[PDB]
Design a protein around this motif. Structure first.
Motif, PDB file in Angstrom:
ATOM      1  N   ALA A  42       0.824  -1.206   0.000  1.00  0.00           N
ATOM      2  CA  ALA A  42       0.000   0.000   0.000  1.00  0.00           C
ATOM      3  C   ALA A  42       0.852   1.247   0.000  1.00  0.00           C
ATOM      4  N   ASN A  43       0.311   2.297  -0.600  1.00  0.00           N
ATOM      5  CA  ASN A  43       0.966   3.595  -0.620  1.00  0.00           C
ATOM      6  C   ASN A  43      -0.079   4.630  -0.258  1.00  0.00           C
ATOM      7  N   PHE A  44       0.340   5.762   0.303  1.00  0.00           N
ATOM      8  CA  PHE A  44      -0.588   6.852   0.631  1.00  0.00           C
ATOM      9  C   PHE A  44      -0.153   8.168  -0.041  1.00  0.00           C
ATOM     10  N   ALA A  45      -1.100   9.032  -0.386  1.00  0.00           N
ATOM     11  CA  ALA A  45      -0.756  10.377  -0.898  1.00  0.00           C
ATOM     12  C   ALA A  45       0.019  11.181   0.133  1.00  0.00           C
ATOM     13  N   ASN A  46      -0.330  11.008   1.404  1.00  0.00           N
ATOM     14  CA  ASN A  46       0.341  11.721   2.481  1.00  0.00           C
ATOM     15  C   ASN A  46       0.698  10.794   3.663  1.00  0.00           C
ATOM     16  N   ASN A  47       1.908  10.252   3.633  1.00  0.00           N
ATOM     17  CA  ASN A  47       2.398   9.396   4.707  1.00  0.00           C
ATOM     18  C   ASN A  47       2.456  10.128   6.027  1.00  0.00           C
TER      19      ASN A  47
END
Lengths: 55, 91, 50, 41, 24, 41
Positions: free
Chosen positions: B15-20
């Motif tokens: 998973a990846n996020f726009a804002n970690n």
């Protein structure tokens, strides 16, 4: 001035680390210029002078 | 398997996020999605957004500078209190 | 673990796409679920190609 | 072309490490001076 | 006199900073 | 012309830092004298 000195020290440490890192079946490796041209199984292209290949 | 055959059992997702920076720390190095981080966008290692699975002095200095600033602030405060006490006794 | 999941030190279960079919494969349409690594046995197969 | 078919570095690193030490000494000294001034009122 | 002394101290500090930069 | 093909400094800095310390001491002393005069009435 203190901040600048700290930054300089950090840069020196980074340089030292880099120096340490640098210090650390067919065979056709290359002592010259030119790179072999390689691809991964997705087709992305890479380059290397290492000439150690297996069939 | 011992019959010289293999079976695929699953495939791990990444998973990846726009804002970690928006993720809520759950302790250890575990995290929960939030409105701030955005929804998880999923994929697999070696495709799209994700690469394959793989298989200090400056900080200390910064802390010293901070501690120093705090000391200066404390000194300024103590001084302010002394001035107030002198004024009160002035009538 | 005993449940045949891959767990971190807090017991949380690693997730991913399940395998389906015979032979088992991974589909693009799948919901992530706890990975399992079953111990269980294989069925015996009658030959249909040679 | 066709297919075919260290001391200086260590010294440089020593010089670098030295410079870093000098920088650290300068920093520590600067901090000492600041502490003396703060106590001066 | 106090102001002059403070100015002198500031100048000395600036000189020290410049020397440090040169050394770096 | 053609193309071709530290201790003293550190000491000076020490002298400077020293002078700054002396100046700071003089300032702190001046402040103390002023405070004593103010309390004198």
């Amino acid at each position: 001035s203190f901040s600048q000195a700290v930054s300089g020290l950090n840069a020196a440490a980074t340089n030292l680390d880099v120096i340490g890192n640098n210090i650390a079946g067919l065979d056709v490796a290359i002592s010259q210029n030119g790179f072999f041209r390689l691809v991964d199984s997705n087709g992305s292209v890479f380059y290397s002078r290492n000439g150690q290949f297996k069939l | 398997y011992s019959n010289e055959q293999e079976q695929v059992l699953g495939q791990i997702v990444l998973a990846n996020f726009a804002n970690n920076e928006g993720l809520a720390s759950q302790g250890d190095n575990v995290w929960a999605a939030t409105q701030a981080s955005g929804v998880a966008l999923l994929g697999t290692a070696g495709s799209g957004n994700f690469g394959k699975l793989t298989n200090l002095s400056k900080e200390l200095v910064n802390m010293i500078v901070a501690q120093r600033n705090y000391q200066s602030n404390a000194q300024t405060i103590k001084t302010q209190d002394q001035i107030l006490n002198t004024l009160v006794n002035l009538r | 673990d005993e449940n045949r999941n891959l767990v971190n030190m807090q017991g949380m279960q690693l997730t991913g796409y399940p395998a389906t079919g015979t032979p088992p494969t991974i589909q693009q349409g799948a919901n992530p679920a706890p990975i399992t690594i079953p111990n269980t046995l294989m069925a015996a197969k009658s030959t249909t190609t040679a």
